[PDB]
Nucleic acid binder design. Structure first.
Ligand SMILES: [Zn+2]
Ligand SMILES: [Zn+2]
Ligand SMILES: [Zn+2]
Length: 85
DNA sequence: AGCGTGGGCAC
DNA sequence: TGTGCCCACGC
């Protein structure tokens, strides 16, 4: 863990430098990815893709047990466990 | 539930 | 560097 966050108040450390560059945006407040539907800005392209699904209703992830659909795989992952008991 | 959003990391 | 998942936490 060689790459430490330069911001004094921040004591985060990272493996690869590209991680520090992404992380540094939490301090600069930079959000280079905009949703052309609601005009909101996001820090990351992947979070914008999933955000947009809230507008379109696209839900590519279906539960293997009941078939319920989700916009994100983690929502599906969190849901699937309700079938156990 | 709905979903923002940082961290780890593959390609 | 850029793109894009998984993973996990938070409200
Ligand atoms: Zn920092
Ligand atoms: Zn939007
Ligand atoms: Zn289910």
């Amino acid at each position: 863990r060689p790459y430490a966050c330069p911001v004094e108040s921040c004591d985060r450390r990272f493996s690869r430098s590209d991680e520090l560059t992404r992380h540094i945006r939490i301090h600069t407040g930079q959000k280079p990815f905009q949703c052309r539907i609601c005009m909101r800005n996001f820090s990351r392209s992947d979070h914008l893709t999933t955000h947009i699904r809230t507008h379109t209703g696209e839900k590519p992830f279906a539960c293997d047990i009941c078939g319920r659909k989700f916009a994100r795989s983690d929502e599906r992952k969190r849901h699937t466990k309700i079938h156990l008991r």
